[PDB]
């Protein structure tokens, strides 16, 4: 059925509501999606009651306990093809004397315009509160925030921080309360806010290869798309066994594209397809890694091609 694993774990607070959509791509996002717990068995119940149930193609952890931490699998069985995806998900309770646990605190890789710009991440599927996103209550270092519009302001899923003669360093929490079946549970995120801004401390960000493993067979051939989001002067290039793809390599080929962003120059995308005429037993030994430089940093991500199981 061809497996694909997402090596990155998505840590989230326990005793809350949580969703987990299928990290899918273009040519694969087709009919039929199915979820399971560690290993293959009977799929997570669609029974709308039950704590852990699937609904609208997503995996819903209603009270999301700690004993739910692990690997979940997502399957796409169209008719001719099927795709199983391993994801890894951790649920953590807050450290003693804190309204949060360090493991679940996010950090933005690419900033937005303004002295603030905090965006409560992962609320998209909760926007389902009758089409509009529920009123977000905000915090800083665990203490409540008054959205009076002179110190801070609340708009949709964002939190604008006003330019006061203040230290903004802190661990901000966004809080919503979803109502499901005549009872509501909390939803929280924590984003760490810094000082790096104004000039251009923005290094390129590789969105495509997301530290994952793909299962392919020796005979066949593939194509690996590296997608970056940065300025048109940044650079996206693939490497293997600690070396850039040879400009005259027989099996491997590297094409560099660029998609300009009219809306925002600073945030355009760069594609670098690494073609592979034929998979070889030497490629199963190391991971393929995309790279992106800009003199303000370097970002790197990978995809590990592994031999199909017994």
């Amino acid at each position: 059925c061809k497996e694909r694993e997402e090596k990155i774990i998505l840590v989230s607070s326990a005793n809350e509501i949580d969703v987990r959509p299928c990290p899918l791509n273009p040519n694969e996002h087709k009919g039929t999606i199915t979820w399971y717990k560690d290993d293959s068995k009977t799929p997570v119940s669609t029974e709308q009651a039950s704590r852990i149930h699937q609904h609208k193609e997503k995996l819903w952890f209603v009270p999301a306990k700690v004993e739910d931490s692990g690997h979940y699998y997502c399957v796409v069985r169209n008719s001719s093809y099927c795709l199983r995806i391993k994801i890894s998900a951790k649920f953590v309770e807050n450290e003693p004397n804190l309204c949060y646990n360090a493991q679940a605190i996010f950090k933005q890789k690419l900033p937005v315009a303004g002295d603030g710009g905090l965006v409560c991440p992962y609320m998209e599927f909760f926007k389902n509160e009758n089409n509009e996103l529920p009123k977000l209550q905000w915090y800083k270092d665990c203490k409540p925030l008054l959205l009076d519009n002179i110190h801070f302001s609340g708009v949709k899923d964002r939190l604008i921080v006003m330019n006061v003669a203040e230290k903004h360093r802190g661990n901000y929490t966004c809080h919503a309360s979803y109502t499901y079946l005549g009872k509501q549970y909390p939803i929280t995120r924590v984003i760490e806010f810094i000082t790096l801004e104004e000039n251009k401390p923005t290094r390129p960000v590789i969105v495509s290869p997301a530290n994952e493993t793909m299962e392919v067979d020796l005979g066949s051939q593939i194509q690996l798309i590296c997608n970056v989001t940065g300025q048109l002067s940044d650079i996206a290039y693939w490497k293997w066994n600690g070396s850039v793809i040879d400009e005259d390599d027989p099996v491997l080929g590297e094409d560099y594209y660029s998609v300009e962003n009219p809306a925002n120059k600073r945030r355009s995308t760069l594609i670098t397809v690494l073609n592979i005429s034929e998979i070889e037993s030497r490629f199963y030994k190391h991971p393929f890694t995309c790279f992106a430089k800009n003199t303000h940093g370097i970002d790197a991500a990978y995809i590990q091609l592994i031999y199909p199981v017994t």
């Binding site: 951790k90 493991q103 679940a104 996010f106 926007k127």
Partner: peptide, 21 residues
Amino acid sequence: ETPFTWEESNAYYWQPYALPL
């Protein structure tokens, strides 16, 4: 308004303090 999506949250966010399973 163009509110953040999940694909967008994955793309432009990461957990530096997160630990393995």
